[PDB]
Amino acid sequence: TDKLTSLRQYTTVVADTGDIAAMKLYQPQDATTNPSLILNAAQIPEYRKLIDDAVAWAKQQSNDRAQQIVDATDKLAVNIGLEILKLVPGRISTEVDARLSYDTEASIAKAKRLIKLYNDAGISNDRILIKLASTWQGIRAAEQLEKEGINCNLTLLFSFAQARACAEAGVFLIAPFVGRILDWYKANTDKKEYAPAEDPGVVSVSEIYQYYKEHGYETVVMGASFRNIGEILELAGCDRLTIAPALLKELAESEGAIERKLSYTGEVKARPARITESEFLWQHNQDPMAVDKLAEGIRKFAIDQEKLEKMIGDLL
Template identity: 60%
Template sequence: MTSKLEQLKQFTTVVADTGDLEAITRLKPYDATTNPSLLLKASSIESYASHLNDSVLDVKGDLGLAADRFAVAVGGGILKVIPGRISTEVDARLSFDENALLGKAHQIIDLYDKAGISRDRVLIKLASTWEGIRAAEKLEKEGIQCNLTLLFSFAQAQACADAGVFLISPFVGRIYDWYKKSTGQEYTGAEDPGVQSVTRIYNYYKANDYKTVVMGASFRNISQIEELAGCDRLTISPELLQKLSDDQGELPQKLKPGNPGEPRQTLNEAQFRWASNEDAMATDKLAEGIRQFARDQEKLEAVLAAKVK
C-alpha cells in the first residue's frame, strides 16, 4: 500500500502551503503558495538571510517594494524545486482598492520578469473582496493568472467564477474554527462546515462547467483533507503533508465531477455585498484574515527596515 499522500496525488494536485524550501524539496508538491505570514516565518530562516539583505538594496525607503522583492526571491527559489507554480500575495492592506491592487500585481509580475521567471509559473494572490475580484478579472484578461484567497462564502466563489479567475482558495480550517467557537461543537468528517463549503463550491463549479480551479486551503487535520480528496487542488502545510506521507491507510476519492450542483447565478455588486453581509462567518473571517495578513506584512517590513543601511 502506498502512502495517503501518494494516493492523494493520483486525483488531486498537491500544493505546499509554506515558504520552507527544505520541506518543499522533501515532500515534492506540484505547486506552492506563500502569504505574508509564511514570508514572515521565512525571514527568520538563515538560508534566506541573503535574500533579505538583497531585497532592501536601493529601495529608497519603499519597504513595500522590498517586501515584494523578498517574496519574489523566495518564490524564485521554490520554483527551482517544483514543476508547477508559485502563488505570491499582494499586500492585504490594498484589499479594497482595485487600482492599487492592479499596480501592486504588475509590480510583482515585473519583478518575476526581471528574475527571468515567466508569468505562466506565477499566480497573483488577491483577497476575495469585490475589489480584489474585479482586479483579478482585469489581470486575467492581460494574461496574468490569479489565486483568489481568503474565500469563505459561496457568494465569493460565485463572483470569482463569473470573473474568470484561474483559481480560488476556499479556507476549510478557518471556517471550522468559527463554527467550533460559535457553537461549542466538534465537527468531523463530512459534517465539518469547512468541508461542506468546499464540497458545495466544487459541485457548483463542475455542474456549471466553470473552468476556475478549486483549491481547498487552511487545514486543521487529516480528516478534512481526506473528505476533500479529489478536489482540483489542495494546499497543505508541511506538517500535514508529512502525516499523509507517513500514513499507509487507504484514501478513497470523495469529490468527482458529475454530482448535482446549484444552478448558475451571476451576482451584481449589490447582490454580492448583501450575500456577504448575510453570512456572519464569512464577514468575520474575511475581515480577520485581511487584518492578520496586514499585521504580518507590517512585521515583515519592520524586519526589512532593520536591514536598511
C-alpha cells in the same frame, strides 16, 4: 502505500509554506505563500542571503528610504518565490499587500509590480499566480488582471457569494479556506467537535466544487487551511489542495489507500445571470462566519506585512 501517494491519484498536491526544505521532501506540483509565511520564512537562517540580496537590490533602484522598504519587501517575497520555483514544476503563489484589499486600482498596480519583478528575474507569467483577497474589489481587480495575462489566486474565500463572483469573473483559481471556517464554528457554536463529513469547512468546499463543475467553470478549486488530515481525506478529488508541511508529513506516514470523495459525473448546466455588487454584498453579509473571517484575515495579513517592513527597515 501511504496516504500522500494515494491522494496524488485524485488531487494535485500543493505545499503551503515558504520553506524550500518541504519542496524537496514532498515534491509538490505548486507551492503557495502568504504574508505570514513570508514573515516566518524570513526567520530561517539560510534565507539571510535572500534578505541581503533584496535590500542590496532595493538600494540600487532608488535613494528614497520609503521606496526602498517597499522595493526590499516586494523583492524578498519574489526572491523566496524564485528559490521555490527551482524545486517545483508548477506555480508559486505570491500575495499582494493586504492593505490594498479594498482598493481595486491599487491592487492591480501592485500585482503588475510583482509580475514585473518576476519577469526581471526571467520568470514568465505562466509560472506565477498573484494572490488577492476575495473582496468585491479584489475580484474586480482579478477580472482585469486575467484579461491582461496575469493569472490570479483568489484567497480568503468564505461565502458562497464570493465563490460565485469569482467563477463569474473567470479567475484562474480560488482557494476556499476549510480550517478557518471550522475555527469559527468551534468558537461561536456549542459543538466543538465535528466528524470529517460534517466539518463546516469541508461542506462549504464540497458545495463550491459541485457548483463549479456543474456549470462548467474552468476556475481551479484549491482547498486550503487544514486543521487535521480528516478534512483533507474528505476532500480527496478536489482539483488541488495546498497543505502545510506538518500535515503533509502525517499523510506520508500513514498507510492505506484512500477513496475519491469529490466528483461530479453529470452534464454541464447553463450558467445564470451574473451577480451584481448589491446582490453580492447582501448574500455575503447573510453569512455571519464569512463576515467575521474575511475582515479578520485581511487584518492579520496586513499586520504581518507591517512587521516585515519593520524588519526590513532596520536593515536599511
